[PDB]
Design a protein around this ligand. Structure first.
Ligand SMILES: OC[C@H](C[C@H]1CCOC1)Nc1ncnc2[nH]ccc12
Length: 167
């Protein structure tokens, strides 16, 4: 039993809700919140901009030190950093950004990072400003993640389409 509330169950391990991931994290304080990161950990917009703003830019400060030491992530890769005031940990995961021409096949690799954590609060990878089809992203999530994932979908209209179109 965990403290996630109001989710629709899609499969044995995937749950979904129309919610703002920032507000969900502040309420639940999950062990792991997933950020929709880029390889430079430059948290400008979308989920990343929102999570960082909620940390008063502490996420960006920590991320800049991480990059200075380690260099950029790979598309499809991840790193674990602090969750600041939102969660114990933040798993920064880089899905492919279709608006950069990146290979959508890398979306499965991106979701594989979730399997290293027993329970996660997460967005749909490569959705929103990353330019991928969210229905496809949800499909890849369900077919790749085996650990317990609680998906927050910001847009109510998209959420309803995701639920009603889910196979
Ligand atoms: O893939 C990133 C998704 C895409 C959007 C497009 C419409 O709904 C989902 N973004 C987010 N999902 C959940 N919480 C969020 N808070 C701020 C941004 C955000």
């Amino acid at each position: 039993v965990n403290s996630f509330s109001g989710y629709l169950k899609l499969t044995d391990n995937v749950y979904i809700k129309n919610a703002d991931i920032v507000e969900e994290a502040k309420k639940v304080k999950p062990t792991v919140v997933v950020n929709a990161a880029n390889v430079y950990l430059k948290h400008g917009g979308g989920v990343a901009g929102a999570l960082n703003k909620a940390t008063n830019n502490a996420m960006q400060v920590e991320s800049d030190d991480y990059i200075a030491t380690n260099g950029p992530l790979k598309v499809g890769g991840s790193c674990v950093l602090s969750g600041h005031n939102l969660a114990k940990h933040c798993l920064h995961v880089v899905g492919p950004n279709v608006n950069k021409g990146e290979d959508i096949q890398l979306l499965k690799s991106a979701y594989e990072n979730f399997n290293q954590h027993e329970v996660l609060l997460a967005p749909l990878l490569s959705a929103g400003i990353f330019g991928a089809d969210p229905i496809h992203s949800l499909r890849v999530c369900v077919d790749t993640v085996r650990t317990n994932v609680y998906l927050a979908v910001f847009d109510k209209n998209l959420y309803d389409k995701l639920v009603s179109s889910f196979l």
